[PDB]
Amino acid sequence: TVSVSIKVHFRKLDFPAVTICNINPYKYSTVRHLLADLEQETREALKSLYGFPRFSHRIPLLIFDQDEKGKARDFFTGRKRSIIHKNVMHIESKQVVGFQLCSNDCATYTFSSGINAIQEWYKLHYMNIMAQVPLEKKINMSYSAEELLVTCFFDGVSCDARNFTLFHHPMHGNCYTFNNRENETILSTSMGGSEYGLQVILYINEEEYNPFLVSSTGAKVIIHRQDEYPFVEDVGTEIETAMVTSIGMHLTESFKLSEPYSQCTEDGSDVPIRNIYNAAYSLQICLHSCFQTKMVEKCGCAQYSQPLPPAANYCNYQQHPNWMYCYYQLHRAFVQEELGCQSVCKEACSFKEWTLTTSLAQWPSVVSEKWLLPVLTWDQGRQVNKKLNKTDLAKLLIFYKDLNQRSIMESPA
């Protein structure tokens, strides 16, 4: 059995790996020609809600009267007519929109608000399409570093797009990562506070967001160890446009003792699960990597929301009709801890985490706006010719609050 402790020291310190991603995965105009057909059926659907009189054939939208169960009706077929509730503007609609999935018996979804259903339904067909496009075309089709980043600095030293590793994410496009280029010295800070950390100005043109994906105009960032995997879909911090985001941070280093009643691994060598992520071991990695494998074993393909195991295709209805139901089964089984993954996988015996302490400020200030934006388009001035609008930019600072090597340590008893 074990006991706990806390300790810290004040050495000049190494800097984390910083990943940046535009929340909008692809320049809308550059994907439009792939999606236009779907952008007709969606709008036709929305046009069905109020004010007006092939994809739908695969995943048919449905209207469910809560008067009945096992009874559902085509969203484009006939309908008419409200359940009371306690100005007052809340009521529950007797009808509700949804869609279903089947294997050949079926499983469904239904959404509080019609418009919400459509936008989920759209997200399905969006993936059902993009899963069929090759990586090179995607990477060519998403943002480039030299246009995503307007400027950046680190302890006054400048940085170019050169200093960023490309990292393509299936759901967020071209993410870029600072301070983790291979065979180069990891950056470090000898001073705490903003002006000694990373500062960068992002460009985020709302004009190219594809409307049918719900999001705010902004960018994600993730802080992680150089050999670690971002998991952009989950753990990131989003940045709103037209603001400073001052992400101060403390480093924290964690450790745990190995006992039969306190198990862990130093590098994952203990588990049979192969690691498909090309990144250091971690509980989340070993789980998902096991999940993808279990899926390929029983649905003949891999989920598009994750990297792709070897000798497998990315799932898509057009090639695997019973795909989504198969997925649904597994995911539920996984949540029910029925799949082996949840049992044989284990934590790391030690890890680092950057405890963030974010805060926001309006930028540029209303007076400064009159000149700063012109200059910020003389910078980048051969790549862009518009006068940038305030909402096209976002300023970001990453910096250590204090150069303190905080840690948590254990001793046996």
């Binding site: 170019d160 805060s359 400020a361």
Partner: protein, 424 residues
């Protein structure tokens, strides 16, 4: 041998000391008479970068190049490796911004016989750095007792204030001229008076502040960011809000939950820890503010000390030992260069870092920050009318809605985590 202790909980205790500062160190309308020429020059520089075709020799060459000659910008054109070129900014006249073109300041000394180019890879960086340095060269010439009046007075900033249930008004804060932000207002500093306690967690028992930024009066080319700078710290600490401070955005009810850590170190061979700073050889210039010792204070005064040796002068952003003087180029034409050396030579970072001992009795205020837009429609008009009648107490009324920040600063449901390192 070693010994340790650990804990968590809540208890009635002394509230932090809190500082508020406006991000623009001066009310433009109260100082532009002193910056008119610099701004006029700045506008031309921008014109001469952004759109030269709009310029005219009979319009530009009226300007006060005696300011420019002190520390000019230059284009470094090195996209011809076999022959680089340097151009002072004073069929198109458009200046280069290609890959091989860099924007730089030519710092100089010794009747400007010696000079060094300081680089920036973007105009936005260069221009801000330049203006800041020029402005600094002007502010130094002003006696503080007058300059203090050109910052936002508390009477304008702190529209409304409350502490738990207890009443409040700007006169309850202490005022210090923190040179990078002008007037900073410290709450509950515990220096002049006994510090306030607080009995309970939750917003109902913290600070409530409603602050007015007055964006319309910011110094145009300074102060790129809007919203109050804010910091928490122990009683009788300076604080060094330029580095350790949080922001809070206008038009929001930025709400800060607080949690306290405290630590003491084991001893010198485990870390050179001093109890009250009486050991170190550094003069600790800040002592006129009766603050305690702190690693920060020692570093900065150490920097200032070296500069008083190397440049017979003291830089504007740090206090002065009473006999010395701030660095006007009028009086020390080489100060900018002399200063830059102490910035660039990392040996001068480390010699102080080696000389200044760590502070014992460490105290840290962990913060969790949260926001929501404010006021909502259910509150705006009538609260802003109430506050309008607060601003109506001005000799002549002035109003705005874009400029108001609201803060809540309070302890979390557990408010202390004592920890210890002790020899045994």
């Amino acid at each position: 041998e070693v010994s340790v202790s650990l804990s968590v909980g809540f208890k009635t205790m002394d509230f932090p000391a809190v500082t508020i500062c406006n991000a623009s160190p001066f009310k433009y309308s109260k100082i532009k008479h002193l910056l008119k020429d610099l701004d006029e020059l700045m506008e031309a520089v921008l014109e001469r970068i952004l759109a030269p075709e709009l310029s005219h020799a009979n319009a530009t060459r009226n300007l006060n190049f005696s300011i420019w000659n002190h520390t000019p910008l230059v284009l470094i054109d090195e996209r011809n490796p076999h022959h680089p070129m340097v151009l002072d900014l004073f069929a198109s006249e458009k200046i280069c911004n290609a890959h091989g073109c860099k924007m730089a300041m030519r710092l100089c000394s010794l009747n400007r016989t010696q000079c060094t180019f300081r680089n920036f890879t973007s105009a936005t960086q260069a221009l801000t750095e330049w203006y800041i340095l020029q402005a600094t060269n002007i502010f130094a010439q002003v006696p503080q007792q007058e300059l203090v009046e050109m910052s936002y007075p508390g009477e304008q900033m702190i529209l409304a204030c409350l502490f738990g249930a207890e009443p409040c008004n700007y006169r309850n804060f202490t005022s210090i001229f923190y040179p990078h932000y002008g007037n900073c207002y410290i709450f509950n500093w515990g220096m002049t008076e006994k510090a306030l306690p607080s009995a309970n967690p939750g917003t109902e028992f913290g600070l409530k502040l409603i602050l007015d930024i007055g964006q319309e009066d910011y110094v145009p080319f300074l102060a790129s960011t809007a919203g109050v700078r804010l910091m928490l710290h122990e009683q009788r600490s300076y604080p060094f809000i330029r580095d350790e401070g949080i922001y809070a955005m206008s038009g929001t009810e930025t709400s800060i939950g607080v949690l306290v850590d405290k630590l003491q170190r084991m001893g010198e061979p485990y870390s050179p820890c001093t109890v009250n700073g009486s050991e170190v050889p550094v003069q600790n210039f800040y002592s006129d503010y009766n603050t305690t010792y702190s690693i920060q204070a020692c570093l900065r005064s150490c920097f200032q000390d070296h500069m008083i040796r190397n440049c017979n002068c003291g830089h504007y952003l740090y206090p002065l030992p009473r006999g010395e003087k701030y660095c006007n180029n009028r009086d020390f034409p080489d100060w900018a260069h002399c200063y830059s050396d102490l910035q660039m030579s990392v040996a001068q970072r480390e010699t102080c870092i080696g000389m200044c001992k760590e502070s014992c009795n460490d105290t840290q205020y962990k913060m969790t920050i949260s926001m929501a837009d404010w006021p909502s429609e259910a509150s705006e008009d009538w609260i802003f009318h109430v506050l309008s009648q607060e601003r109506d107490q001005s000799t002549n009324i002035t109003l705005s809605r874009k400029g108001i920040v609201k803060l809540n600063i309070y302890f979390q449901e557990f408010n202390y985590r004592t920890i210890e390192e002790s020899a045994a």
